[PDB]
């Protein structure tokens, strides 16, 4: 019952699409931002009733299946499978018609003008929505964390981003990229489980290892102390059943895994850590505004969810940046969804609509409308 | 003649009415069907819709202690059926809704009913665009309680299902 | 269509042939696939009208011949004597013409392409059959038991197979055969009765020992507990009543006979038993699927008929399978002909002529037609 | 002479353990990585002596043994049978005392560096050695093939190892295991002989299946091109002589068996073959060194001994990778002892004290000295 | 005991004379080596230089096409060696005269020449200094003309190598 309806909100994050409605206080769909197509069926499995799979479904259903993230390195390079992710979101996971619902999309930091305009095309051409917008992830997490000026670290699954923000506007040139993300920490978890003598090679083992990572990993505050306490423990080691009922066991690996996000040196990568890339983003900004960027470090993203990470960030920043400014982190307990929560609450308010792109403005003036709405 | 029965398109009318939301103003509260069942027509040619005890919306509060309960306490005791269920469930991080496709087979049923419904497992399913989870249900001990339906849906990821907490 | 010929179903099985009309859910011809070729030359005055006596006519001789199966090893290892078996099926046992009726013919699992091609050749060229169809024994047993996913144990006469199935497709990397079967249980029964000093030596007594197996054996629930009891009381034994002979009374050998299936050591094999081979089949199937096979172990074939065997299967598999896995075995009331009955049922559905291999499709596509026309 | 101490040299990789002295081009002990520990009780037990059946003994005393393979997938975890198979190599095969002899041992690919300390530990605190040293078998094989930089492969009878190397150092993130080699190839051999109705099922008959595997098999230059050449060959089918004087014929199995190293599809693995494993390894290395890896792919190893394998490795990588890359697959005419003889020829020059850990240096430092000496 | 081998500075005395420039109008022409081979001893404790032919920059007038395309016609197909080449490549952007180290190890050369020259390869590579490039070369077909040598120096600056346009 048109513009008086509840708006649809989809956070289009780098390896987890989080979606629902404006006034759902937690998401209504969560699935991997991955698409695939089977190969080699008839030889070890029956021929696919779906000759293309998306999400968890694409990891589940058997064959020599070739997967892709269409947002492969944090920018949407392929549209062919990203338009399948949006089709899958609405008609398969949320189980609504997008032609019913005004739609808030998010974008990952650095999203090109032509990607923003193609994201405006898709909602009116491929999905026929009444109205929409495309908002940057970091500002919703920042505003829900109670700031309009500050710095967001997002660590997603397919990219990590360090984003200085001044009254809702992020400064693009000073944004620092880190190409090591959640998927790649899972590759190091597979390696250190191979050192413990496990097979872990298949997609079926890897997504159990990806579950084990989010269920059981933590960041050590002092790694040498943690490894000395590991060599004298009675609690570190954790047994875990595989879904066929076979038991495995993981321990020290729970803190060896995410340590590489702060200290890439730990895997021989000649790159700077999340604290240094945050510091390098702040230290490129003008002197008179740096003070309250150190007091307002927001943790967004899926890979910032590990215990001890914000407390380690506090330690690692005070071991790197001077102590005359007051250092503060703000790291919400549901942080992976905090972006979408900020989206849900903002997208419930019909109280000013100049920022919302209508189908009228599209049929007048095309996708280029998306730049006039940022004001 | 040596293959299974065809799907009659009136199951696709039912599926694409069941599976979707509507506007919540009235139409969600007045048009949804939470459980729906299909049968082999005794022409022996096709799967159709049958006199089967569905529930809608108010029927869950006004009488039957959960909707899934209304279906799985009233399954035909000695014949096989195809069914859909609109599962609405709570995980450890989100709400979710998923579309269950159900082959019901009571293990004591006729061997020729079983063969007809088994050889149409391929045929009916290509029409049911966006089916997530398939149940092959083999006896009422493959239903059990409502927590076993959460295990048969999504395992330990689910913590509440249909308003029954697991 | 349904006002035309009552299609024939021949199960070639594993050493015992079963045949009859489709939709009659019990077999009407049933004979051993044994061919009796002479051990010397015959006289030319009073000469016989066949080179070799087959089945009923092979066993209804004495001394003059050597008995051999054409399908000895669970695949057709002589074709001329199998061409004879089908000639003897039509004209000696099933008692119909081949070019009258549609024929459904069972195939054994793990056959090469050429087996399916030569079986299609035979029926069109050697026997002039109008309409042919081919099906895997386990799928017929599984679908008659109302499953589409599960694992069928088919314990036959000359071979035992374990066939794991997922969405009707049998997973070829995880099918397992064992050469031990109903033949050798009867041969071992004869030898353990020779320990009891019974005469049992002739080809006539060998069929009485088949009957002593059918009418008197069971699987022991726990062998050493059953052996301790059966060594301390005769309140476990029973007579086989011979009409010409006397009360041949079978004690411990009632259960030491089929114990061979769980303990191949009694046959002198170092090999894995039925429960080991079922578990090894399941644990070689893909990690998801293992859940669904444990809950759907279907029994088929003649050697699964003994009392206590399903009871024993649930006991001895929970000494292998994880205590968190939910194990459910399915033994049909009689399960002996489940294969053929599933074929009889499938060859009398009121739906689809288009799955019969017609002689007019063989005209275009040759022997390879069978590989287009199967599920 | 009787001075200038010639050291012992031992290799352990994924199958055959190989041992002898330095400078000597032949091993003096060669046997498989196999230790049989009982299913419960052994056979011919009395006064115990070394009651785990090792090598030659284990296959010759079948059935009751749960056969373990101390070094198999590369990382040793089954370390107590590793103790016993080293003891067997020294005191049962070679029949010398490690108490006299400086022992050079190999590290097999993928081992965590604490596994070097555990062999330093065992060689002093169990075998009482005067000195030890360790190097990587893959690097010794690459050096013996005349390279310091390149990508070496060893397919044994445990797994296949694939190791990219720059100037003697293996590149950590790009080392790859593929869980398919000779043992599982030799299982598939028996399945494709089962298609013709041969069954060989004891451990004593499994000797025939290796004898066929080692002698008669080769890689097809292309699968269906070889099938078309077989269909017109006067010499593809070989009448095979069994140990007990019986005769069979091994045929089209000769190539369709080895085909498995490129086709893990016949084993039910999503993990790709040796060709794609070598490419995906080089694709996880820096731009300026991939040139030397493609131009120096060295086929070493046990089951890698086949004709056609390097020839076929060219075909499937030139179809997979952009055709402007230059790829040389090198395979020497014997390649099996390259690992060990590289260790012997590296050792061959006498008098050294730098990179050997001596007993008197262990006494004040423990095993951790190995990381200061073994590269 | 894994002793290895050592380079005596007789290999370095010829390297120094080869490496460094002198008077251009004669002594660049005929007091510079353009090619040399280095060899393991019969004893095998050391690397040496022998009669394995050295040629200069001017000898293109007296005999050859260029010195290094003469040197590849004199390389031992059945032994492993080290070599050294002062590779001249010419263009308008740069006149590059680079000293290159070469490990020669033919497919046909024996495994116990191979493993000895391969393990001492990067001891000699640390004794030389003012080398720019290195080749690991494994047969005649990896070295058979200048155009195949220029690929292993790389870039796009090698428009000509050893006076021959590519």
Tab-separated table of N, CA and C in Angstrom, chain C residues 51-178:
chain	number	residue	atom	x	y	z
C	51	UNK	N	22.423	-78.246	-26.366
C	51	UNK	CA	23.829	-78.597	-26.084
C	51	UNK	C	24.042	-78.766	-24.569
C	52	UNK	N	23.307	-77.971	-23.796
C	52	UNK	CA	23.442	-77.772	-22.379
C	52	UNK	C	22.041	-77.614	-21.790
C	53	UNK	N	21.837	-78.173	-20.598
C	53	UNK	CA	20.591	-78.085	-19.856
C	53	UNK	C	20.779	-76.975	-18.820
C	54	UNK	N	19.787	-76.095	-18.692
C	54	UNK	CA	19.838	-74.859	-17.922
C	54	UNK	C	18.805	-74.951	-16.785
C	55	UNK	N	19.126	-74.379	-15.619
C	55	UNK	CA	18.213	-74.108	-14.515
C	55	UNK	C	17.578	-75.348	-13.891
C	56	UNK	N	16.248	-75.399	-13.958
C	56	UNK	CA	15.345	-76.512	-13.678
C	56	UNK	C	15.828	-77.795	-14.372
C	57	UNK	N	16.152	-77.721	-15.668
C	57	UNK	CA	16.652	-78.848	-16.436
C	57	UNK	C	18.119	-79.177	-16.125
C	58	UNK	N	18.924	-78.249	-15.587
C	58	UNK	CA	20.319	-78.497	-15.208
C	58	UNK	C	20.363	-79.299	-13.903
C	59	UNK	N	19.548	-78.888	-12.920
C	59	UNK	CA	19.439	-79.545	-11.621
C	59	UNK	C	18.684	-80.881	-11.752
C	60	UNK	N	17.742	-80.995	-12.700
C	60	UNK	CA	17.054	-82.243	-13.037
C	60	UNK	C	17.890	-83.065	-14.050
C	61	UNK	N	19.152	-83.336	-13.699
C	61	UNK	CA	20.076	-84.325	-14.256
C	61	UNK	C	20.880	-84.910	-13.083
C	62	UNK	N	21.869	-85.761	-13.370
C	62	UNK	CA	22.812	-86.287	-12.397
C	62	UNK	C	24.130	-86.595	-13.124
C	63	UNK	N	25.271	-86.227	-12.526
C	63	UNK	CA	26.650	-86.642	-12.836
C	63	UNK	C	27.265	-86.295	-14.204
C	64	UNK	N	26.475	-86.243	-15.280
C	64	UNK	CA	26.932	-86.158	-16.674
C	64	UNK	C	27.501	-84.769	-17.063
C	65	UNK	N	27.282	-83.743	-16.234
C	65	UNK	CA	27.494	-82.336	-16.540
C	65	UNK	C	28.213	-81.597	-15.408
C	66	UNK	N	28.811	-80.456	-15.756
C	66	UNK	CA	29.439	-79.503	-14.859
C	66	UNK	C	28.550	-78.244	-14.873
C	67	UNK	N	28.216	-77.737	-13.681
C	67	UNK	CA	27.294	-76.629	-13.461
C	67	UNK	C	28.110	-75.338	-13.304
C	68	UNK	N	27.739	-74.289	-14.046
C	68	UNK	CA	28.412	-72.998	-14.114
C	68	UNK	C	27.350	-71.895	-14.240
C	69	UNK	N	27.567	-70.733	-13.610
C	69	UNK	CA	26.767	-69.526	-13.830
C	69	UNK	C	27.435	-68.731	-14.981
C	70	UNK	N	26.682	-68.098	-15.909
C	70	UNK	CA	27.243	-67.159	-16.895
C	70	UNK	C	27.588	-65.788	-16.282
C	71	UNK	N	26.934	-65.425	-15.174
C	71	UNK	CA	27.018	-64.147	-14.468
C	71	UNK	C	27.778	-64.322	-13.130
C	72	UNK	N	28.696	-65.302	-13.071
C	72	UNK	CA	29.382	-65.835	-11.882
C	72	UNK	C	29.884	-64.802	-10.853
C	73	UNK	N	30.487	-63.711	-11.339
C	73	UNK	CA	31.232	-62.740	-10.525
C	73	UNK	C	30.440	-61.437	-10.320
C	74	UNK	N	29.146	-61.436	-10.664
C	74	UNK	CA	28.248	-60.289	-10.536
C	74	UNK	C	28.206	-59.408	-11.789
C	75	UNK	N	28.864	-59.851	-12.862
C	75	UNK	CA	28.859	-59.294	-14.204
C	75	UNK	C	28.850	-60.491	-15.167
C	76	UNK	N	28.374	-60.304	-16.403
C	76	UNK	CA	28.157	-61.376	-17.376
C	76	UNK	C	29.521	-61.744	-18.001
C	77	UNK	N	30.128	-62.814	-17.483
C	77	UNK	CA	31.459	-63.321	-17.802
C	77	UNK	C	31.436	-64.431	-18.880
C	78	UNK	N	30.259	-64.929	-19.280
C	78	UNK	CA	30.021	-65.525	-20.599
C	78	UNK	C	28.684	-64.982	-21.081
C	79	UNK	N	28.641	-64.564	-22.347
C	79	UNK	CA	27.449	-64.038	-22.985
C	79	UNK	C	26.642	-65.139	-23.671
C	80	UNK	N	27.245	-66.198	-24.254
C	80	UNK	CA	26.491	-67.238	-24.992
C	80	UNK	C	25.554	-67.982	-24.021
C	81	UNK	N	26.067	-68.372	-22.845
C	81	UNK	CA	25.292	-69.007	-21.778
C	81	UNK	C	24.316	-68.026	-21.099
C	82	UNK	N	24.498	-66.703	-21.230
C	82	UNK	CA	23.520	-65.712	-20.765
C	82	UNK	C	22.423	-65.500	-21.833
C	83	UNK	N	22.780	-65.549	-23.126
C	83	UNK	CA	21.879	-65.586	-24.279
C	83	UNK	C	21.002	-66.861	-24.172
C	84	UNK	N	21.589	-68.007	-23.772
C	84	UNK	CA	20.875	-69.237	-23.400
C	84	UNK	C	19.921	-69.032	-22.210
C	85	UNK	N	20.351	-68.353	-21.134
C	85	UNK	CA	19.520	-68.032	-19.966
C	85	UNK	C	18.263	-67.247	-20.363
C	86	UNK	N	18.378	-66.254	-21.250
C	86	UNK	CA	17.227	-65.496	-21.734
C	86	UNK	C	16.347	-66.319	-22.686
C	87	UNK	N	16.940	-67.204	-23.499
C	87	UNK	CA	16.219	-68.159	-24.344
C	87	UNK	C	15.432	-69.165	-23.479
C	88	UNK	N	16.066	-69.676	-22.415
C	88	UNK	CA	15.463	-70.561	-21.425
C	88	UNK	C	14.410	-69.819	-20.581
C	89	UNK	N	14.613	-68.529	-20.269
C	89	UNK	CA	13.632	-67.670	-19.602
C	89	UNK	C	12.348	-67.615	-20.444
C	90	UNK	N	12.388	-67.072	-21.671
C	90	UNK	CA	11.221	-66.947	-22.553
C	90	UNK	C	10.530	-68.294	-22.829
C	91	UNK	N	11.275	-69.290	-23.322
C	91	UNK	CA	10.681	-70.478	-23.931
C	91	UNK	C	10.615	-71.700	-22.994
C	92	UNK	N	11.273	-71.691	-21.822
C	92	UNK	CA	11.294	-72.825	-20.882
C	92	UNK	C	10.645	-72.481	-19.529
C	93	UNK	N	10.649	-71.207	-19.080
C	93	UNK	CA	10.301	-70.808	-17.702
C	93	UNK	C	9.226	-69.701	-17.611
C	94	UNK	N	9.382	-68.571	-18.305
C	94	UNK	CA	8.401	-67.482	-18.354
C	94	UNK	C	7.222	-67.869	-19.260
C	95	UNK	N	7.500	-68.594	-20.354
C	95	UNK	CA	6.551	-69.366	-21.158
C	95	UNK	C	5.667	-68.447	-22.035
C	96	UNK	N	6.292	-67.428	-22.643
C	96	UNK	CA	5.731	-66.395	-23.528
C	96	UNK	C	6.706	-66.173	-24.701
C	97	UNK	N	6.301	-65.473	-25.770
C	97	UNK	CA	7.229	-65.088	-26.835
C	97	UNK	C	7.898	-63.745	-26.464
C	98	UNK	N	9.150	-63.492	-26.899
C	98	UNK	CA	9.853	-62.240	-26.590
C	98	UNK	C	9.326	-61.035	-27.383
C	99	UNK	N	9.002	-61.227	-28.666
C	99	UNK	CA	8.561	-60.181	-29.583
C	99	UNK	C	7.056	-59.869	-29.464
C	100	UNK	N	6.368	-60.442	-28.464
C	100	UNK	CA	5.005	-60.083	-28.074
C	100	UNK	C	5.057	-58.809	-27.203
C	101	UNK	N	5.776	-58.855	-26.071
C	101	UNK	CA	5.600	-57.919	-24.951
C	101	UNK	C	6.799	-56.960	-24.825
C	102	UNK	N	6.607	-55.731	-24.287
C	102	UNK	CA	7.686	-54.913	-23.715
C	102	UNK	C	8.441	-55.672	-22.601
C	103	UNK	N	9.762	-55.499	-22.521
C	103	UNK	CA	10.620	-56.168	-21.545
C	103	UNK	C	11.348	-55.102	-20.709
C	104	UNK	N	11.274	-55.170	-19.373
C	104	UNK	CA	12.189	-54.475	-18.467
C	104	UNK	C	13.197	-55.526	-17.965
C	105	UNK	N	14.491	-55.212	-18.079
C	105	UNK	CA	15.614	-56.074	-17.727
C	105	UNK	C	16.467	-55.354	-16.668
C	106	UNK	N	16.750	-55.977	-15.513
C	106	UNK	CA	17.614	-55.373	-14.489
C	106	UNK	C	19.097	-55.430	-14.913
C	107	UNK	N	19.867	-54.411	-14.514
C	107	UNK	CA	21.316	-54.342	-14.647
C	107	UNK	C	21.937	-54.407	-13.241
C	108	UNK	N	23.160	-54.944	-13.166
C	108	UNK	CA	23.987	-54.957	-11.964
C	108	UNK	C	24.782	-53.636	-11.880
C	109	UNK	N	25.041	-53.094	-10.669
C	109	UNK	CA	25.851	-51.886	-10.495
C	109	UNK	C	27.341	-52.202	-10.713
C	110	UNK	N	28.074	-51.224	-11.262
C	110	UNK	CA	29.510	-51.254	-11.574
C	110	UNK	C	29.819	-51.976	-12.900
C	111	UNK	N	28.803	-52.152	-13.755
C	111	UNK	CA	28.951	-52.665	-15.117
C	111	UNK	C	29.620	-51.610	-16.035
C	112	UNK	N	30.397	-52.020	-17.063
C	112	UNK	CA	30.879	-51.112	-18.109
C	112	UNK	C	29.768	-50.867	-19.146
C	113	UNK	N	29.834	-49.734	-19.863
C	113	UNK	CA	28.874	-49.252	-20.876
C	113	UNK	C	28.365	-50.351	-21.837
C	114	UNK	N	29.317	-51.167	-22.313
C	114	UNK	CA	29.169	-52.295	-23.228
C	114	UNK	C	28.200	-53.382	-22.739
C	115	UNK	N	28.011	-53.513	-21.416
C	115	UNK	CA	27.054	-54.438	-20.803
C	115	UNK	C	25.619	-53.993	-21.120
C	116	UNK	N	25.364	-52.685	-21.009
C	116	UNK	CA	24.065	-52.059	-21.240
C	116	UNK	C	23.745	-52.082	-22.746
C	117	UNK	N	24.764	-51.816	-23.574
C	117	UNK	CA	24.729	-51.832	-25.035
C	117	UNK	C	24.476	-53.261	-25.570
C	118	UNK	N	25.255	-54.277	-25.149
C	118	UNK	CA	25.044	-55.681	-25.534
C	118	UNK	C	23.708	-56.233	-24.992
C	119	UNK	N	23.237	-55.848	-23.794
C	119	UNK	CA	21.903	-56.264	-23.326
C	119	UNK	C	20.758	-55.648	-24.155
C	120	UNK	N	20.958	-54.446	-24.708
C	120	UNK	CA	19.999	-53.794	-25.601
C	120	UNK	C	20.027	-54.481	-26.989
C	121	UNK	N	21.226	-54.817	-27.503
C	121	UNK	CA	21.481	-55.594	-28.727
C	121	UNK	C	20.689	-56.910	-28.746
C	122	UNK	N	20.897	-57.750	-27.717
C	122	UNK	CA	20.297	-59.077	-27.537
C	122	UNK	C	18.780	-59.063	-27.736
C	123	UNK	N	18.110	-58.142	-27.040
C	123	UNK	CA	16.659	-58.112	-27.005
C	123	UNK	C	16.080	-57.664	-28.355
C	124	UNK	N	16.729	-56.725	-29.056
C	124	UNK	CA	16.273	-56.272	-30.370
C	124	UNK	C	16.657	-57.228	-31.508
C	125	UNK	N	17.852	-57.828	-31.492
C	125	UNK	CA	18.378	-58.577	-32.633
C	125	UNK	C	18.210	-60.090	-32.439
C	126	UNK	N	18.602	-60.646	-31.284
C	126	UNK	CA	18.547	-62.088	-31.035
C	126	UNK	C	17.104	-62.530	-30.684
C	127	UNK	N	16.264	-61.632	-30.137
C	127	UNK	CA	14.928	-61.965	-29.618
C	127	UNK	C	13.789	-61.116	-30.201
C	128	UNK	N	14.091	-60.076	-30.989
C	128	UNK	CA	13.137	-59.275	-31.772
C	128	UNK	C	12.140	-58.435	-30.931
C	129	UNK	N	12.381	-58.239	-29.623
C	129	UNK	CA	11.586	-57.461	-28.655
C	129	UNK	C	11.242	-56.044	-29.193
C	130	UNK	N	9.995	-55.539	-29.054
C	130	UNK	CA	9.611	-54.227	-29.601
C	130	UNK	C	10.107	-53.030	-28.764
C	131	UNK	N	10.065	-53.159	-27.432
C	131	UNK	CA	10.251	-52.109	-26.440
C	131	UNK	C	11.073	-52.662	-25.273
C	132	UNK	N	12.180	-51.997	-24.925
C	132	UNK	CA	13.126	-52.424	-23.893
C	132	UNK	C	13.358	-51.287	-22.893
C	133	UNK	N	13.594	-51.598	-21.615
C	133	UNK	CA	13.986	-50.631	-20.587
C	133	UNK	C	14.913	-51.307	-19.568
C	134	UNK	N	15.807	-50.525	-18.954
C	134	UNK	CA	16.907	-50.988	-18.117
C	134	UNK	C	16.883	-50.159	-16.829
C	135	UNK	N	17.061	-50.810	-15.671
C	135	UNK	CA	17.054	-50.187	-14.351
C	135	UNK	C	18.003	-50.899	-13.379
C	136	UNK	N	18.607	-50.122	-12.476
C	136	UNK	CA	19.517	-50.557	-11.423
C	136	UNK	C	18.657	-51.077	-10.251
C	137	UNK	N	18.893	-52.336	-9.858
C	137	UNK	CA	18.251	-53.090	-8.775
C	137	UNK	C	17.988	-52.324	-7.460
C	138	UNK	N	18.973	-51.529	-7.038
C	138	UNK	CA	18.985	-50.762	-5.804
C	138	UNK	C	17.983	-49.604	-5.865
C	139	UNK	N	17.897	-48.901	-7.002
C	139	UNK	CA	16.945	-47.812	-7.235
C	139	UNK	C	15.499	-48.349	-7.167
C	140	UNK	N	15.241	-49.522	-7.770
C	140	UNK	CA	13.955	-50.226	-7.710
C	140	UNK	C	13.571	-50.591	-6.262
C	141	UNK	N	14.550	-51.060	-5.471
C	141	UNK	CA	14.384	-51.433	-4.061
C	141	UNK	C	14.145	-50.182	-3.180
C	142	UNK	N	14.900	-49.104	-3.445
C	142	UNK	CA	14.901	-47.834	-2.722
C	142	UNK	C	13.576	-47.088	-2.951
C	143	UNK	N	13.105	-47.023	-4.204
C	143	UNK	CA	11.873	-46.325	-4.570
C	143	UNK	C	10.645	-47.130	-4.104
C	144	UNK	N	10.697	-48.474	-4.109
C	144	UNK	CA	9.651	-49.332	-3.533
C	144	UNK	C	9.574	-49.199	-1.999
C	145	UNK	N	10.691	-48.848	-1.351
C	145	UNK	CA	10.774	-48.545	0.078
C	145	UNK	C	10.468	-47.054	0.370
C	146	UNK	N	10.154	-46.257	-0.666
C	146	UNK	CA	9.729	-44.861	-0.569
C	146	UNK	C	10.863	-43.874	-0.278
C	147	UNK	N	12.105	-44.223	-0.625
C	147	UNK	CA	13.286	-43.373	-0.497
C	147	UNK	C	13.709	-42.889	-1.901
C	148	UNK	N	14.369	-41.727	-1.961
C	148	UNK	CA	15.091	-41.201	-3.127
C	148	UNK	C	16.591	-41.023	-2.792
C	149	UNK	N	16.922	-40.854	-1.504
C	149	UNK	CA	18.261	-40.825	-0.928
C	149	UNK	C	18.296	-41.948	0.130
C	150	UNK	N	19.426	-42.658	0.240
C	150	UNK	CA	19.677	-43.738	1.198
C	150	UNK	C	20.770	-44.688	0.688
C	151	UNK	N	21.052	-45.782	1.404
C	151	UNK	CA	22.021	-46.810	1.010
C	151	UNK	C	21.315	-48.166	1.002
C	152	UNK	N	21.340	-48.863	-0.136
C	152	UNK	CA	20.773	-50.194	-0.270
C	152	UNK	C	21.931	-51.188	-0.104
C	153	UNK	N	21.772	-52.126	0.835
C	153	UNK	CA	22.514	-53.379	0.892
C	153	UNK	C	21.671	-54.363	0.069
C	154	UNK	N	22.246	-54.937	-0.989
C	154	UNK	CA	21.651	-55.983	-1.822
C	154	UNK	C	22.548	-57.211	-1.640
C	155	UNK	N	22.167	-58.119	-0.731
C	155	UNK	CA	22.923	-59.338	-0.455
C	155	UNK	C	22.249	-60.466	-1.243
C	156	UNK	N	22.885	-60.853	-2.346
C	156	UNK	CA	22.333	-61.715	-3.368
C	156	UNK	C	22.656	-63.194	-3.162
C	157	UNK	N	22.735	-63.924	-4.281
C	157	UNK	CA	23.120	-65.339	-4.343
C	157	UNK	C	24.636	-65.466	-4.588
C	158	UNK	N	25.166	-64.808	-5.626
C	158	UNK	CA	26.562	-64.912	-6.037
C	158	UNK	C	27.436	-63.699	-5.691
C	159	UNK	N	26.839	-62.554	-5.334
C	159	UNK	CA	27.514	-61.335	-4.880
C	159	UNK	C	26.619	-60.595	-3.874
C	160	UNK	N	27.235	-59.838	-2.959
C	160	UNK	CA	26.589	-58.837	-2.117
C	160	UNK	C	27.116	-57.456	-2.558
C	161	UNK	N	26.228	-56.471	-2.730
C	161	UNK	CA	26.523	-55.082	-3.072
C	161	UNK	C	26.012	-54.158	-1.962
C	162	UNK	N	26.752	-53.082	-1.687
C	162	UNK	CA	26.329	-51.882	-0.967
C	162	UNK	C	26.347	-50.727	-1.971
C	163	UNK	N	25.196	-50.080	-2.193
C	163	UNK	CA	24.982	-49.019	-3.183
C	163	UNK	C	24.435	-47.756	-2.466
C	164	UNK	N	25.250	-46.707	-2.197
C	164	UNK	CA	24.786	-45.429	-1.623
C	164	UNK	C	24.219	-44.494	-2.711
C	165	UNK	N	23.040	-43.908	-2.462
C	165	UNK	CA	22.203	-43.171	-3.408
C	165	UNK	C	21.794	-41.807	-2.805
C	166	UNK	N	21.780	-40.753	-3.632
C	166	UNK	CA	21.522	-39.356	-3.280
C	166	UNK	C	20.747	-38.711	-4.441
C	167	UNK	N	19.472	-38.326	-4.236
C	167	UNK	CA	18.554	-37.736	-5.239
C	167	UNK	C	18.342	-38.707	-6.430
C	168	UNK	N	18.268	-40.010	-6.134
C	168	UNK	CA	18.135	-41.104	-7.094
C	168	UNK	C	19.446	-41.519	-7.779
C	169	UNK	N	20.494	-40.688	-7.732
C	169	UNK	CA	21.795	-40.959	-8.336
C	169	UNK	C	22.623	-41.814	-7.360
C	170	UNK	N	23.186	-42.934	-7.830
C	170	UNK	CA	24.067	-43.816	-7.065
C	170	UNK	C	25.508	-43.302	-7.194
C	171	UNK	N	26.160	-43.007	-6.064
C	171	UNK	CA	27.468	-42.353	-5.984
C	171	UNK	C	28.577	-43.383	-6.311
C	172	UNK	N	29.209	-43.349	-7.510
C	172	UNK	CA	30.030	-44.463	-8.015
C	172	UNK	C	31.358	-44.646	-7.269
C	173	UNK	N	31.906	-43.554	-6.722
C	173	UNK	CA	33.106	-43.510	-5.892
C	173	UNK	C	32.949	-44.220	-4.532
C	174	UNK	N	31.733	-44.651	-4.164
C	174	UNK	CA	31.386	-45.202	-2.860
C	174	UNK	C	30.557	-46.496	-2.897
C	175	UNK	N	30.200	-47.032	-4.077
C	175	UNK	CA	29.605	-48.371	-4.219
C	175	UNK	C	30.683	-49.420	-3.876
C	176	UNK	N	30.294	-50.478	-3.158
C	176	UNK	CA	31.163	-51.573	-2.737
C	176	UNK	C	30.465	-52.907	-2.996
C	177	UNK	N	31.172	-53.862	-3.612
C	177	UNK	CA	30.756	-55.251	-3.777
C	177	UNK	C	31.598	-56.106	-2.817
C	178	UNK	N	31.064	-57.260	-2.427
C	178	UNK	CA	31.735	-58.335	-1.717
C	178	UNK	C	31.278	-59.632	-2.392
